Assembly symmetry: D3
Homo-oligomer: 231 residues x 6
């Protein structure tokens, strides 16, 4: 277990996956009862606690498919995780989305070579577990949250060579851009476990709008509640 050093049993079957290990710290201290730090390797904090009687873990994943994939592989294969929910921010690429909107990723497009290699150029659609997608949606609805369910783009490239790199994706209905969901969805299917990616729109890549630190924390807190209730 090279990247997570914890005894077997230290990680719950249900796990939240923020990217930032400090966001994992924040979640554990604010949302979990009796949180226990089980991982410090590479400063990639992982905690285990309880939420309304359910055992839940929260583990930083790092940025991009290659990093997140290492943690996901180890969590599933070595620690026996079964329900993986990524919680994150994303940049909106259509004006149909507003700042602070919640996006639940039905599928994840990608520019990564991950599946081009696996399927020899054929097209595999990495998808959310429908049961999780459905219940997360119901949770957001019951809170009156602006929520969209649809496509995201998982990019390898935060900083593209050219401007307006997402125009074509938007024309084909893609809602927002992040960097990991395609990897999570593909690995979940590979191992036959369940996964979901939930996102809050922190930036609007079309209007140039940005969320204030107060706005971020408020909608972030709500997202975490949704994930914890779903899981």
């Amino acid at each position: 277990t090279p990247h997570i050093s914890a005894p077997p049993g230290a990680v719950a079957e249900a796990i939240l996956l923020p990217g930032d290990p400090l966001r994992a710290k924040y979640i554990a201290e604010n949302f979990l009862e009796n949180p226990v730090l089980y991982n410090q390797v590479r400063n990639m904090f992982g905690y285990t606690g309880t939420y309304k009687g359910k055992r839940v873990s929260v583990q930083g994943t790092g940025m991009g498919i290659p990093s997140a994939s290492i943690y996901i592989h180890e969590l599933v294969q070595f620690y026996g995780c079964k329900t993986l929910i990524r919680v994150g921010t994303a940049g909106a690429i259509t004006e149909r989305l507003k700042l602070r909107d919640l996006v639940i990723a039905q599928a994840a497009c990608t520019d990564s070579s991950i599946n081009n290699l696996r399927f020899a150029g054929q097209n595999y659609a990495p998808i959310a577990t429908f049961d999780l997608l459905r219940r997360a949606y119901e949770q957001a609805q019951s809170r009156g949250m602006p929520v969209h369910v649809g496509n995201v783009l998982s990019t390898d490239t935060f900083y593209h060579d050219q401007p307006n790199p997402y125009q074509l994706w938007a024309q084909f209905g893609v809602l927002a851009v992040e960097m990991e969901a395609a990897g999570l969805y593909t690995l979940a299917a590979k191992f036959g476990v369940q996964a979901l990616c939930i996102l809050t729109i922190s930036d609007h890549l079309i209007t140039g709008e940005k969320t204030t630190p107060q706005e971020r924390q408020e909608t972030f807190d709500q997202m975490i509640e949704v994930a914890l209730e779903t899981i």
Copy 2:
């Protein structure tokens, strides 16, 4: 239009899309009030009638993304269609599925070059309209139907060069194989309309089991009922 010769007005905004024109005839005659044929070009029957007082059309699409894409394009761009539901059969590629199960396609993988060409080799995930997916799922649940929501593979190739062509897809959670869903989902996104593909398992490609003519009809009718209630 070149392939549908009816005037604007003859075709309803909500449309069922079977592949076989004789299935279009069947659906129209058995499930719609006052069905009237609007198209005979290439024997590709299209009908319009009413369901619970609202107009619904039913149009044969032919087999494969290239044929279906012609009809879908014309229906949306020339006939103003807004809600497009494919109903069809599919071959199960996993033992998790049984004959007569309903599959609702959350997304559609493909071996077609359609999106490889459009996205210069990057990976686009053709997806269902979530609202239609959700409503169809709830419809199937309310009837106690065995139903799965997940991936299907839209193939160009009914007869593959080698045996076991679908095993890698199945290993990554793909439920069933058909030939059009990826086209429907991509074009719906292209035009900003709604789409869904619902399928009944008529053939099991792992077990070799096959439904009787009597069995086919019974579950097909049920699928049509689900589709009409989803509009």
Copy 3:
């Protein structure tokens, strides 16, 4: 057998392959002696009759490589067809060609993934049977018909995303666009049978010119005579 329901000797070894089943009907009724229907599945009419004492069949194929491929596979593999001649219309992409010109496809370019998958990205040239090409050419010549022998492009996509999709093809000598020849030529080679695709220019995609219905019929009949004399 799944898409053609006829007994094993119902189809002749020589077969004309229009796309539109209503054109198959027309050909049977007007050019064959004792035409008898052998298929009605999916309204995809097929007939067998005689021409100058020899059995000939005529079978609708539907549009695009995926559809046509299903029929061609079944015809060759189950029904023992040996000589397959596609007769169709095409759109000219060069002003070197005029409306009503006959084009005999020496080979067929494609945007389909069928051979990219088969040959792992290498380039396979789907070609006509030379003997049939030569015989058809001599037939057109003997009638003083304006005829060209060269490349066609078989596209998956009747409706392209952007304007002027065929310019580069034309710069490299491609004469006209249709949707099936590449599939026909590839499968004929796969099974070691003989094939040819003959086309009438019905639309000029550069000049926007279109043939009248009377013009379509006169040249179409001529093409059919050429095809029948070639088999």
Copy 4:
């Protein structure tokens, strides 16, 4: 001009294109009247003479699409060549072919990236000029030469990494392997000039059979006569 140093009228509009400059010498000295050398750059001999009162040139090309392409480009673009006939040897990849058979390449498959780059991964079929194909065929026929008209594969790679590199090509009807035809047919189309590739089977890549030097000469001379009578 950088690879052929001759004045602008030194080269004839009709040109034979063997690969080996020493074969160009042989052809000039044995089949042409008043042969005169016009090129010595890189030892890539080119000659102009007459055949039955009409000027004909013969120019060495070197091996492979990159080399041959340099000569073909310069010949067409700087020297005004219009009719280019490659005469060469090839390896048969099907037992349907025998040593000493003549193959006239109707088209040329390739593993070169030349058209994958040009057509962004779509498939272009490089083809012979039909008029030249037909005339050469009639010439071979008139001499009772065993002749086949069909596909060849132009490879970048004389020495493949693994055994049996050509099996799949042969399964799809490809007759023989050489290294230039695809480049010749593509550039002839690029510039709107006429081209043909004629080949003698010198080696059988299936049976391991090889022609004796005496056999090579007799059939080679025959091929040259056919080429000269075709231009």
Copy 5:
């Protein structure tokens, strides 16, 4: 400067890039004079100090091309870094390498889509700055260190689907596998700055050998000295 929050001027023009932020901490505390922490965002520690009078920074990069690329982009474009040396461990894929050997990456092969996308399928070779490569080699030589200069493979995938994934790379002379160098080398060229990747063999992927914690620290310390002397 989203991922590194430091004032401009806080980062030296010369920077070491370990992957693990705790390795950056180790380097700063053991090799640098007056080390100052300038970054804590995402626990991705970055320090600035001096080495033998030279101002040097050390910054954690995270794992994989997507993560490392974010930091590299920001360091170069926002902080003005000019000399970037990645120091890391790698797994050897040839028995010509021994545990504890030093590898200096002359170039970096990859399975990432980074350059396939940029160059539209053409092949770009990401390379080290020769001056750095040369001087690092001279530094290792003067210490009598077992050192190899050549290819590495930068993979997206720590955990491959199949076993023996590196056999073909090894057959073409590739020395070792890591996850970032191709990204570093490509970005360095993109921005016209200088880069190098130096690696110690911590694991042997062929023999299954592994380094002891004492062995790792000893050869690691040596590598850091080499990098600091080179920079």
Copy 6:
């Protein structure tokens, strides 16, 4: 061998590889003691003589990866060659380089399909033998020659379809264009022998400047001297 007809023993282990057989003749006659021709097949001159009492061969390769690859394969596999140094000219694609500069190819980018085919679309970086690279660099330095070590592009295509084909390569640091280095470097790795490609800038593809015949000779001779001292 098929393309080099000399016995084993005639060819030395160290070999210079110009492209032009007349350059091979030049090198042999002007730089070697007792040069003796060993090959005349296809006018592709090869010589063996001595340099400072050790045998050195010189062999023409032709133009492009397919031709050069034939000779390289035969030299290594049949003639036992162990050290292969290409000497040639190249076109500069950056203003950083001046006419008459020496370029030593650290690696070779390519548009050839050679490695795309071998590595199923992943990216292999063809590299020089570092020891030869280092020694050649030191040789050039000792003579005060303007020398650069870095990337070159090996193209299949001397005459591109559109203007400015090399600008993207230049933006990513590529120094100069030639047609063979990528082949030489890949095959050397394939066979586990040494290789290096040294080039003089004879043409500037940005400025359009060109060296005089007198200039070419002077810097060419110097390059040969460097090459012979590198053995």
